[PDB]
Design a protein around this ligand. Sequence first.
Ligand SMILES: [Hg+2]
Ligand SMILES: [Hg+2]
Ligand SMILES: [Hg+2]
Ligand SMILES: [Hg+2]
Ligand SMILES: [Hg+2]
Ligand SMILES: [Hg+2]
Ligand SMILES: [Hg+2]
Ligand SMILES: [Hg+2]
Ligand SMILES: [Hg+2]
Ligand SMILES: [Hg+2]
Ligand SMILES: [Hg+2]
Ligand SMILES: [Hg+2]
Ligand SMILES: [Hg+2]
Ligand SMILES: [Mn+2]
Ligand SMILES: [Mn+2]
Ligand SMILES: [Mn+2]
Ligand SMILES: [Mn+2]
Lengths: 340, 340
Amino acid sequence: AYTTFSATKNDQLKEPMFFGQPVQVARYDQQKYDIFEKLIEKQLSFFWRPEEVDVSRDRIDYQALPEHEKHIFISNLKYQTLLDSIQGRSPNVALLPLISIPELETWVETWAFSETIHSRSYTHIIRNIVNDPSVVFDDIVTNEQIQKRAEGISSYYDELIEMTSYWHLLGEGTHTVNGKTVTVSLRELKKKLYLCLMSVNALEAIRFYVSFACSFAFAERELMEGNAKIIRLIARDEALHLTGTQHMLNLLRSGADDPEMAEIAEECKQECYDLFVQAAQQEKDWADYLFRDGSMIGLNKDILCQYVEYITNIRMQAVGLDLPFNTRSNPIPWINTWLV
Amino acid sequence: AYTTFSATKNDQLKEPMFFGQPVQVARYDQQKYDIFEKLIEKQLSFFWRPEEVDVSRDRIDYQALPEHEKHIFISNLKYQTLLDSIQGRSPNVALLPLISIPELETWVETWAFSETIHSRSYTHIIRNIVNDPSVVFDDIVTNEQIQKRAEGISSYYDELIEMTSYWHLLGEGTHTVNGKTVTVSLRELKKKLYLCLMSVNALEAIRFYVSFACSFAFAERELMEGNAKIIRLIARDEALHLTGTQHMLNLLRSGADDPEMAEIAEECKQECYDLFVQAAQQEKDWADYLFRDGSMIGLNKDILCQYVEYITNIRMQAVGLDLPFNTRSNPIPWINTWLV
Ligand SMILES: [Hg+2]
Ligand SMILES: [Hg+2]
Ligand SMILES: [Hg+2]
Ligand SMILES: [Hg+2]
Ligand SMILES: [Hg+2]
Ligand SMILES: [Hg+2]
Ligand SMILES: [Hg+2]
Ligand SMILES: [Hg+2]
Ligand SMILES: [Hg+2]
Ligand SMILES: [Hg+2]
Ligand SMILES: [Hg+2]
Ligand SMILES: [Hg+2]
Ligand SMILES: [Hg+2]
Ligand SMILES: [Mn+2]
Ligand SMILES: [Mn+2]
Ligand SMILES: [Mn+2]
Ligand SMILES: [Mn+2]
């Protein structure tokens, strides 16, 4: 099953990305896929520290905000904090026991690490603008609506982690565990990982980009500029994370890695279409809560719905799926000045 | 029973470090133990990249070394590579599914990330001094002499990972798995974690510190100066990682955190004492492979075995175990010019 140092001298250049022999020597002189090496380098160039960004004027700007847009700001912030809390721990708990090449193993640990920095920046902002952080942080867990647009994220990772432990302990086969039949199939585990990856792709490429647009609406009005400095940095890292899953998924589709992953990508092309349409509709539903006690001059549900469509079509194309929505030009081209 | 976002609103200030509820919100505004937040902050400010230390002249110096001394240099480096290959991945795969407080969860991910940068620095050194890297890297896996501890270190981690998968899947009790009986006990899992934590403490506290003495003896002779600049920054990092395991162990045995961990630490006293003398012995034995073809100026088998004894006594002292070796002063004071 899993070992932290596998004892077989193997050619790490001939392993698949996932499900081969566990990585044991971590070397960076040679890589099967150099894009993961490029990404580690680029991410390390971008090392930034949240504490050094001045957000003192955002306490005054936030204070001056009307209650309805104070509600938009904080609800957006609470969802960003939910997503990076899961992205901090989950690439490491779910993907890291299944990797077989070194450059992907380290990219995954570098990717989960930059998410904990994003979590730290959210503590930095909340602690400056609000007088007791705990009403924000305890509300994340319990808000029916924040969990409602998050529906499916923790489930995908949790099902993957469970299936992986059954495969590590028991191996492929049909087994009797406490008098129940349990079938472990590597093919099924492979599509569980593939759909997990496709969901991670939706999360980083769409869900964060909708939240970024809600954030920079305020900076366009010249409000909350400290928070906009941080989100600009967060966004520059999400660019890399997104590029990462786009290539993981496209090399798996190419059939140049594990040939059975090419096969799975085709067989579930419909599930991959259906999870992006689900995630698009979830981001749209949230608008009913975001503009609940009032909308904003440049930002309302029609602008949010038109941007979700816009961004979902771009992302789906980048990974070879059919576009669900009618083509449109970018409803909010001002976000270009702020981006990634 | 692992989840990447538990839905229960819980006071994570009252949670135990391990085997409580999985962390769901990542917050850094309050913490149960301030030391892990302090270790994250120090580690972030220590960030360095290997690429800007030039190891160029180290090629001439290595080529000019007497054969036996280049055997010592390279065999020491090979061991440093094995131990950080294991340490990049293993905090994350073995500890992360068991943590119940956020500041410890993000210290384990920051801890593990700084190890991969150490693995990147060993590739930077080897690439430059031994223009065919695969000779060095393929020999770490198979080398008989490096191997005995490789196996011992990975064994603690692998049995904890395995017992943890059984615990999350089946929970406690007596279960049947394909005709066999399998008994899962949280008490045993707690011992397993404790012995593993004790072994990671020996690795960073003793095993790395014996290899530092071998790297700085060359720098004392003004040879391998690029390598020396890099081990200086690695060593600075290791001091923090060692502070961490010391505090987690001392808080666990005090009974301050979980009262059952205090009991387990008491029952395990003689086998923790034995794991440490075994670590020191395996370090002492490596010296006969190292002084295979002869010895060096400033370091030899006897002075080196004295240092192992000295350093083991200090580290066992700090974690409140009885000292195994007869007390002495530091055999090689010069080393303090390079350590923190
Ligand atoms: Hg995933
Ligand atoms: Hg997922
Ligand atoms: Hg928005
Ligand atoms: Hg697909
Ligand atoms: Hg819409
Ligand atoms: Hg261990
Ligand atoms: Hg451990
Ligand atoms: Hg040594
Ligand atoms: Hg040496
Ligand atoms: Hg030594
Ligand atoms: Hg013990
Ligand atoms: Hg002990
Ligand atoms: Hg021990
Ligand atoms: Mn993020
Ligand atoms: Mn991300
Ligand atoms: Mn290290
Ligand atoms: Mn370390």
